[PDB]
Nucleic acid binder design. Structure first.
Lengths: 261, 261
DNA sequence: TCGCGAATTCGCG
DNA sequence: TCGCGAATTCGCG
């Protein structure tokens, strides 16, 4: 906690702040540590923007739109920095998804399944939707050398450890973390090419195969491994980390703004 | 229709063959036009395979698995070719998704909405799930210079033209193709970087921004623009086209197998 | 067995 | 208004 970061995180903790509201708290923290640079927070990017960024890499890209005022709303919002050339650069994007009511059911006594008999519920695939926004922002940032997209997972479908929950009638039901009846965590790992979860993957890797070279944009996938609620303090700390990492990678475009002024 | 391709497509038409069954019909067609090369059809790729292909590009990739026997099943299956080095190369992957019951409701008389009153139903986002399999196969093929992934869309949520449907009580309800109450087509266009839909995008583009260079893997997104059922003949023709295009891009690795033998 | 997949209705600004 | 988003239950081999 470099100075105020400890003061800020406890404010998050004190209020149980959701993901969008923490991303705002980050904007304030950042502008309280970089008072020369200019930060803003959005709750939306409209497809036209993305398309126009796509077009500027190659003129054959970004030539589709079917709904004119179409947009994407990451429920954590976007935080940006104005660089030396008046352009706005994305420093943080974040999302928070929930899947798996199982721990609630078996924390109580409600049997599930078609015939009201099962302790566990066969996990679904809705979480795969999270791959779209990742592609949009990855396309939006196809000229950047960083990818400050952070996902925050919660629920019985993203366990990293074996947890046992006791129902009102004394019985300890047990969730096995690697059971393909509950765990959907593998449905997400395409997003960071099988690199580590709960990790800051913000700086883009450059790999190859032949006369090739290719940049990979990898989402930072964070999960609460015991099905518990996320602690808004650590959620803040993580987002602060990704965004400061983003500012590192942006350094060359930010020199004049924070050194000359 | 180069010879038998006309005979094959009419067989598809005659039987109203679904997507997986057409992909099989393609395997036969291909092996009937390239009798020296060896083709196979799968209905599954397990995560371990993907991970091992990922690892072979860069040793830091592909190091995650939480459910051991986890897999992806494209409902159109995968078609592959054995190259000169005994390795199996993917020549076709295909998926078929349906969203938007609207044309059925207003082809009949069933009013929808919470209070049984609406002619149209606010479209949902389930179709965004289709972005996961795309990432898996794109990662699987991160060493290839082609991406034979084809999506086939159907329903009132993927209209390209304005269509009017008449309900039993004489009334003509009208679907506007660019209404963001029905059209979800924009939720997919992240998958081919805003390049044209209903197009064969199989050969990978290579773009850049600075001292960079990057390969783009773009899904071929085909839609039935009038909410009608797909004609299994044209569905076959399209898949034949993508896969022959794939064989073009594979040419260098296939020479010995079809020329020496 | 275990594990992948369907796509849906409605709420919210 | 229009348009984006929640994630769920159960079926199938």
């Amino acid at each position: 906690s470099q100075g105020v970061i400890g003061i800020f995180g406890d404010y998050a903790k004190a209020h149980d702040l959701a993901v969008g509201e923490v991303s705002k708290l980050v904007k304030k923290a950042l502008s309280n540590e970089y008072p020369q640079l200019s930060f803003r927070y959005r709750d939306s990017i409209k497809k036209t923007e993305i398309n126009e960024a796509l077009k500027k890499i190659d003129p054959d890209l970004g030539g589709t739109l079917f709904v004119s005022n179409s947009s994407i709303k990451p429920d954590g919002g976007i935080v940006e920095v104005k660089d030396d050339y008046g352009e706005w650069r994305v420093v943080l994007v974040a999302e928070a998804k929930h899947q798996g009511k199982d721990i609630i059911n078996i924390r109580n006594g409600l049997l599930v399944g078609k015939r009201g008999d099962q302790d566990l519920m066969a996990a679904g695939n809705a979480i795969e939707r999270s791959h779209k926004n990742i592609s949009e922002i990855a396309n939006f940032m196809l000229s950047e050398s960083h990818f400050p997209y952070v996902l925050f997972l919660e629920g019985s479908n993203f366990l990293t450890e074996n947890i046992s929950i006791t129902r009102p009638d004394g019985r300890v039901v047990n969730l096995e973390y690697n059971s393909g009846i509950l765990n959907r965590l593998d449905r997400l790992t395409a997003a960071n090419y099988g690199m580590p979860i709960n990790s800051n993957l913000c700086i883009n890797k450059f790999v190859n195969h032949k006369d090739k070279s290719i940049m990979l944009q990898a989402a930072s996938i964070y999960t609460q491994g015991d099905g518990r609620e996320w602690d808004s303090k650590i959620m803040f700390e993580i987002m602060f980390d990704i965004s400061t990492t983003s500012l590192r990678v942006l350094g060359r475009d930010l020199f004049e703004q924070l050194t000359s002024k």
